[PDB]
Amino acid sequence: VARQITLLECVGKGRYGEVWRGSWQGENVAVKIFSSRDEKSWFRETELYNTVMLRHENILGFIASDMTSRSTQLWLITHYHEMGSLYDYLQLTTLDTVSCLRIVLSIASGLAHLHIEIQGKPAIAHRDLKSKNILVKKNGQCCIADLGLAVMHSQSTNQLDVGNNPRVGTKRYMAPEVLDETIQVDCFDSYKRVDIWAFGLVLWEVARRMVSNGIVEDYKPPFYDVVPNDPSFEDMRKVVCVDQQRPNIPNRWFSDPTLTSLAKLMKECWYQNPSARLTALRIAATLT
Ligand SMILES: c1ccc2c(-c3cnn4cc(-c5ccc(N6CCNCC6)cc5)cnc34)ccnc2c1
């Protein structure tokens, strides 16, 4: 309830606002303070968390949503994960096979839980999945954060709800059909397929940091070789759509069974034809 929270340190900041480590009732909590340029992401994330009832070990736990003064500020208050995002974590550690699979299996679980219509829930597509939007919990599982762009669908009414956030997704992770603008925006499956695309890119990021035969790759973001920091639409269009480039597989992965499997899963997330891509549920089944 925002007025009982002591802000301690900023652990994240971008055009969209800031995330703070705060103290609430003796526990670390995370406080996302939205920029005035991103108020509608606050609206959407608040909408999801207390109309849809997301409770799942692999989706960031919600505490509260509030307006407050500091001067009007929109606050989203969630669980704090001290290990930070998957993006930070992969830079500061290498993985063994067990902790690599635990990460990727938990992401797949959370994404499948979102995607599946059910104390039920509509089907949800995320639309901004990336290593920076995934937290690492102390038990080594991850959870998915940031529902500001989420879209919903119900089979009982066949109503698709896309909100009206003008926010654009992270360009680095956009699926080819997004970059060439042929995605069919009124069809809910279109959005599940872009989540799968982005999930393959994250899978690639994690796998690089798994040690096999005593070697490992450096952490890199997807497409690190071919686009600058902060690529434009046209930058990403040229790589993914025109040149049809996909992240390269390290040769050493084909000498390890687990990384060979993950390489195959990634492949099947990067089909140009979105309807060929695996589903979250099928990915999670393979990973067990
Ligand atoms: C997207 C991503 C996250 C959130 C979060 C969020 C929830 N918990 N959390 C923790 C951090 C964080 C903690 C510690 C560190 N360091 C110590 C470990 N090594 C790296 C530096 C870095 C980062 C950042 N954001 C969050 C809350 C609400 N919306 C989000 C949307």
Residue numbers in the entry: 204 to 273, 276 to 323, 327 to 496
What does the published report state?
In one ALK2KD mutant (ALK2KD-KK), two lysines within helix I (K492 and K493) were mutated to alanines; in another (ALK2KD-RRK), R490 in helix I, along with R485 and K497 on adjacent loops, were mutated to glutamates. Both ALK2KD mutants had greatly impaired ability to dimerize with wild-type BMPR2KD. In particular, ALK2KD-KK completely lost the ability to dimerize. Mixing of the two kinases together at 2 μM, predicted to promote dimerization based on SEC measurements, resulted only in an additive increase in activity demonstrating an insignificant role of the C-lobe-mediated dimer on kinase catalysis. This conclusion is further reinforced by the observation that mutations that disrupt ALK2KD/BMPR2KD heterodimerization in solution, including the ALK2 mutants: ALK2KD-KK, ALK2KD-RRK, ALK2KD-K492A, ALK2KD-K493A, and BMPR2 mutants: BMPR2KD-EDE and BMPR2KD-EED had no effect on the activity of these kinases. Co-transfection of wild-type ALK2 and BMPR2 yields a significant increase of BMP4-dependent signals compared to the untransfected control. This increase is almost completely eliminated by all mutations at the dimer interface: in ALK2 (ALK2-RRK and ALK2-KK) and BMPR2 (BMPR2-EED, BMPR2-EDE), suggesting that dissociation of C-lobe-mediated ALK2KD/BMPR2KD dimer impairs signaling capacity of the full-length ALK2/BMPR2 receptor complex. The ALK2KD double mutant (ALK2-KK) displayed a dominant effect on the BMP4-induced transcription, almost completely eliminating the basal reporter activity. We also obtained crystal structures of the ALK2KD-KK in the presence of AMPPNP and the ALK2 kinase inhibitor, LDN-193189. Hence, the disruptive effect of these mutations on BMP4-induced ALK2/BMPR2 signaling underscores a functional role of the C-lobe-mediated ALK2/BMPR2 heterodimer in the formation of an active receptor complex.
Upon ligand binding, bone morphogenetic protein (BMP) receptors form active tetrameric complexes, comprised of two type I and two type II receptors, which then transmit signals to SMAD proteins. Here, using hydrogen deuterium exchange mass spectrometry (HDX-MS), small angle X-ray scattering (SAXS) and molecular dynamics (MD) simulations, combined with analysis of SMAD signaling, we show that the kinase domain of the type I receptor ALK2 and type II receptor BMPR2 form a heterodimeric complex via their C-terminal lobes. Formation of this dimer is essential for ligand-induced receptor signaling and is targeted by mutations in BMPR2 in patients with pulmonary arterial hypertension (PAH). We further show that the type I/type II kinase domain heterodimer serves as the scaffold for assembly of the active tetrameric receptor complexes to enable phosphorylation of the GS domain and activation of SMADs.
